[PDB]
Each structure stands twice: as structure tokens, then as C-alpha cells.
Amino acid sequence: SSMSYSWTGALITPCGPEEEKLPINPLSNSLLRYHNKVYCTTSKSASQRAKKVTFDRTQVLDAHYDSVLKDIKLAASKVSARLLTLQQACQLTPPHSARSKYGFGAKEVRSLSGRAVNHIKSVWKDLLEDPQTPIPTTIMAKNEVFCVDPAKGGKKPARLIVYPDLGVRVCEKMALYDITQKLPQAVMGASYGFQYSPAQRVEYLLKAWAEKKDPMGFSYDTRHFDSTVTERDIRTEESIYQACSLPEEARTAIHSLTERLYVGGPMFNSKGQTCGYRRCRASGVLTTSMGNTITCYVKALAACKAAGIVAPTMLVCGDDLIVISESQGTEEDERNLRAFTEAMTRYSAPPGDPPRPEYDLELITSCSSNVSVALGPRGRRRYYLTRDPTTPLARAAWETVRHSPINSWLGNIIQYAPTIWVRMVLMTHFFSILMVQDTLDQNLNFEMYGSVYSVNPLDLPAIIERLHGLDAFSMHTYSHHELTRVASALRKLGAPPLRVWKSRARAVRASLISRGGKAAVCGRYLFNWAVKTKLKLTPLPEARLLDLSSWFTV
Ligand SMILES: Cc1cc2nc3c(=O)[nH]c(=O)nc-3n(C[C@H](O)[C@H](O)[C@H](O)COP(=O)(O)OP(=O)(O)OC[C@H]3O[C@@H](n4cnc5c(N)ncnc54)[C@H](O)[C@@H]3O)c2cc1C
Ligand SMILES: Nc1ccn([C@@H]2O[C@H](COP(=O)(O)OP(=O)(O)O)[C@@H](O)[C@H]2O)c(=O)n1
Ligand SMILES: [Mn+2]
Ligand SMILES: [Mn+2]
Asked: Origin, by domain of life?
């Protein structure tokens, strides 16, 4: 049937400046040496990604899909959702959100400036009066940092991002924000990812594994997921939304947004030249994350029925997917997974790498993370969530006139506190830098799922205990897999071995213990691993006061 994109041949031009690296990276050049391997994706590679995501889609559904969609619309029916006030949608736009063509930006929108509320009023009225005229969109290449992989063809091309004008984006939040806060949870229940903190997600998968008599799990990621969603997928999304109890005014704007924006439309480059036509998901609309996860859940759930997966348990984060199920014998389990893949290829959610049955929780990698195990001095098994540290290290090295890696470090220290690589590398380099800057007690921004939370470095012990528990300061023996990987990534980026980090840490700890106060608590908790006569860590009362609920949610 339809083509994901078509192109006029106009270039995908840069939105602002794409910065050169500098000849000295003074904050991260004592972290790793091979700064030549750290690169940022750029609009240069945008045509390359363009050719990789343009393809003819052929969707073929069936009674399994049809059965799922029916039950998911019924779950949807139990949701009641309201319009947001224009004023509320305004106050939800980020403080740096891309300006409007109509001469005003995030600052006026957040401050309810009259100019802005006026234009946005008339944009809302156009949505309610006009259900057909396509809404134009800007296409830009995403800039993100990676390490090179010669085994994966040098550098990844930039991801394609496609978003409507700032006026339209506020309007989306009025029509759809409340649903984005209620629908996913309701139709997916505990299967919704994006409601679990790292430890909660380990808890969940651990539980799923043990419920099964003979457990078996696999993970799935659709290849170029935004380009695989078809105009029918998007219209089916509208009907899942319309399944809820909504005011009539919202249904009207929801329908207009779907027909005029979500099912597709013309894309213009940043220079204003008309650039192509889009017939798939624009990664940029409000519903990007919700549509990804619900359309992924429905297809994946259908495919489970097609493949005869027994007693499935799912975890769905966008297009990343984990399924813990009852094993039917390894021979059947392989056949079933080909069936699952053939099904989802029929649903137009074809895979990146072919999925594969695994019978060991550490061998299932999804959401770029995996569960792993460490002992204590206890001998007791502590389970946690880790990842390949390559990309975290690469972004620990991204350092230009306009970006500081220091937020990147904090973010990983918070999210992966129990990992050997956070504990021995990032935590050490973090506090070492801040002390030399005399910055320990000056706040940083932690960033996750759009929200930005303020964090004081000297609070990391309490924060980490509230998130991961006191076991995060006691992991004695890490797994052969984890040791191998962290070792290899450190070699790959020219960072010191773990041996050397242990020495550095001993010194860091000594140095902030002897600042007393909150700084010393940091050294006794965060660096208990570096001294041979470990002190007995006690729970921290201030952790009992922290409420980190909304940190790892949506
Ligand atoms: C709803 C949502 C909104 C986000 N908004 C921002 C933002 O405004 N500014 C910012 O700097 N980072 C944003 N991010 C990125 C986010 O903060 C994490 O960095 C990201 O999820 C990578 O963490 P991960 O463990 O899930 O790794 P990953 O394996 O990279 O993510 C797993 C899945 O989450 C989804 N996803 C990944 N990145 C994004 C993304 N940028 N936007 C939407 N979905 C994504 C995808 O479906 C992906 O398959 C957002 C992520 C989500 C899920
Ligand atoms: N920076 C990002 C990353 C992913 N996503 C969404 O998540 C989907 C799948 O995530 P992904 O990491 O597997 O990237 P793809 O190569 O599948 O496009 C995208 O296709 C996007 O719709 C986004 O909106 N912004
Ligand atoms: Mn994908
Ligand atoms: Mn993915």
C-alpha cells in the first residue's frame, strides 16, 4: 500500500548550530582518552537516515490483532479524561521549547503572555472548524552523542524528528495531555513500562520469572518504529482515545489532530523549503510516546496469540518489549518466536535483530538495560539493573562551548547507582571534579522523561537509598558478564582500568571525608567499596523523607 515518506530532494537542514568538538576537553579528559571515538549525530547524515526509513509498508491483520484491539478499546472505555485549559497546556511547555513561526516563544507561552494566548486561541478554533487541512511540520536531524562502532558501520546517522509549530503543540496538550496521563496505565496495567523505577522494574521482571514453572523470556525491538506505523495504526489510535469518556469538544480536536497532523502531512526543512510528505508517526507530537507504547502493546499482544506464547507477561516501553512466558520446550520455543516475528512483520512492526528465547534473566536486554546479579559480603544475591556503559561514557565526554557533561554524569549516577561502572568510575570522577571546582554544594539538574528535577550532589546518599536501597553501597561481587563488559568499554574509550579507578576513589573518599558534614557522608556511603575495612552503613533518616515518585514515570 503506502510509502512511509516521499521526498522532494530538499536538504534536511540544521536547526541552529551543530558544534565542533574542542581541542581540549578539560572536564572529561581525565575520564577517558579516546575522544576521537566520541561523536555527535548531525544533519549531514540526515539524508542517510532518510533513505533507511523510506519503504513501502504492507500491513495484514487478523483475528488475533482484532481480538486484542477489541479488549484494549474496552479497557479504554473505563477512562474519563478532560480537556486542559489553554493556560494549563501553556504552562506545560518546556522552558526552551522551539519558538513559533508567529514571533513568540516558550517564555511567553509559559508566562501566559497575551500575544501567545491569543494566537493559540485561534489555532484551537482552526482545529475545531477544520478537520482536514494538513498541518505543516518541521523535520530536523536529532543531535545525540555516541561512541563509534566499526562493527556497526562507523557512525549512526541522525534520527529524524518531525514536529508542528509551537502553537499546535500547546493545543495538543489541551486535547490529549490528560489521556497521555491515563490511557497507557489503564489499557496495559502492570505491563506499562514508564511507571517503574530501575529497582521496581527489576522487582517486576524477577516476579514474572518466578511465577513461571519453567520460565522463558525474550525481548523485541521494532526496526525504525516511527516509520513502520501506518496511517491505519494512527487512526486506530484515535479510536482507542475516542473509546474513553471525553467531552465533545475534545473529540472534535482529537479527530482534527489525527486527520490533519498525526496520520501525516508535509514536512519543511528549517530553511522553510518544502521537504517531503510523511505518512507515518511524526516523532515529536504529544502522542509519540503513548501511540508508540499502545500500538506496540496491541501488536505484540496479538503476535503472542499468533505464536501461541503461553502465559505471557509483558513489559512495554515504547517499541522495546520484554515477554516472560511459560516455556514449551526449547524446540517449540524457537518455532514460536519465529511465529511471533512473522506475525509482527505482518503487522508492520518488523524487528531490528531477530528475537531469541533465553532461559537466564541476565541474557535478556531491552530498553538498553538488563537485570544482573551481585553478592554482598553477605553471600546474599542482590539483583539490580545495569547497561552497557559505552554510550554513558561517550556522553560523559561530550563537552562543547554550549553543553556540559556534568548533568549526564549525575543522571547515570542516579539511574545506575548499583552498577560497578557508576560506583567505581562515574561516582569517582563526579565528586573529584566537583571538589576541585569547589562545587559539591551547588545544585545540578537531573533530567528524565521531559521533567527536570533539582538535585544537590551532597544529597546523593539519601537519594540513592530511597531509589535502590542500602544494598547499593554493599555490592561485593559482580557477575562475569558485567565485569567483562565494563572492562571492555573502559578499554574501548581509553579510560583507566577498574584497578586505577579504585586508587582514585580511595583518594576521593579521603578528601571528602575530611571536609566533614554532608560531604563526609558522601564519602562513607558512596565509597565504602574502596577501603578494605568497610564501615557499617546505617539507613539515612532524610531518605525516609524524600518522595522520588514522579522521577521515573510520565
Ligand atoms: C515519553 C518520553 C519522553 C522523553 N522526553 C525527553 C525530553 O524532552 N528531553 C530529553 O533530553 N530526553 C527525553 N527522553 C529520554 C529519556 O529521558 C531517557 O533518556 C530515555 O528514555 C533513555 O532512557 P532508556 O533507559 O529508556 O534508554 P532507551 O533504550 O534509549 O529508550 C527505550 C524506549 O524508550 C523510547 N524513547 C527513547 N528515547 C525517547 C525520547 N527522547 N523521546 C520519547 N521516547 C523515547 C523509545 O520508545 C525507546 O525504544 C524521553 C523519554 C520518554 C520515554
Ligand atoms: N530520541 C527519540 C528516540 C526514540 N523515539 C521514538 O521511539 C521509537 C523507537 O525507538 P528506537 O530507539 O528503537 O528508534 P528506531 O530506530 O526504531 O526509530 C522512535 O521510532 C521514535 O518514535 C523518539 O520519539 N525520540
Ligand atoms: Mn526501534
Ligand atoms: Mn527500541
From this structure: Viruses
Residues 192 and 47 in one domain: yes
441 is in an annotated binding site: no
Could you tell me the CA-to-CA distances from 282 to 13, 180, 258, 298 in Å, in that order? 17, 16, 11, 19
Distance (Å) from CA 445 to ligand 2 centroid: 24
Q: Are residues 340 and 383 in the same domain?
A: no
Q: How many helices (H) and strands (E) does the chain have?
A: 22, 15
Residues 349 and 458 in one domain: no
Domain of residue 317: give its range: 291-363
Method: X-ray
- To the question of whether residue 319 is assigned a binding role by annotation, the answer is yes
- Report the SS3 class of residue 96: coil
Residues 158, 143: contact at Cβ < 8 Å? yes
Q: How far is CA 181 from CA 85, 110, 241, in A?
A: 15, 20, 12
Whichever domain contains 320, its CATH number is: 3.30.70.270
What's the CA gap between 352 and 336, in Å, rounded?
A: 18
Cα of 457 vs centre of ligand 4, distance in Å, is 31
Give burial (CB, 10 Å; 0-12/13-18/19+) of 229. buried
**Resolution value in angstroms:** 3.0
| Chain-centroid distance, C-alpha 335 | 31
**The CA-based dihedral angle spanning residues 224, 316, 288, 254, taken in that order and rounded to the nearest 10 degrees:** 130
